[PDB]
Amino acid sequence: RYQLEAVKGTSDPAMLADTIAYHATWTVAEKQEILELTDLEARLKKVLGLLSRDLERFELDKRVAQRVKEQM
Amino acid sequence: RYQLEAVKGTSDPAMLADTIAYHATWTVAEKQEILELTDLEARLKKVLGLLSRDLERFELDKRVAQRVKEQM
Secondary structure (H helix, E strand, C coil): CHHHCCCCCCCCHHHHHHHHHHHCCCCHHHHHHHHHCCCCHHHHHHHHHHHHHHHHHHHHHHHHHHHHHHHC | CHHHHCCCCCCCHHHHHHHHHHCCCCCHHHHHHHHHCCCCHHHHHHHHHHHHHHHHHHHHHHHHHHHHHHHC
């Protein structure tokens, strides 16, 4: 959990947003598309949505695995 | 269950998993495959699934037998 200790110590939203977006390993094409934006709102919203989708898919996969265990 | 209760203080919980697998009635080949497995999580989930299935079979046997007495 050492990647969560580099997002504190300062009070500038832009730098923290940039480093959080960088820390999330995404595809290079989507990284370039994010970098193409001049503001941060749209890219932060996209990253948040992608992370929420990934968490939902992980939980769904675990629950489906348990359900398939019960089914077999 | 006295064998399992006599080894409560035994360390190396892989031993505990193997003993729980050995104390439940299924294929002896399955017992040997689980015991010789080096990893713990895989054997843990496999034995948990076997316990789920045999608990299901015994509970369904109990309710079937209740229906047996009711139908007679």
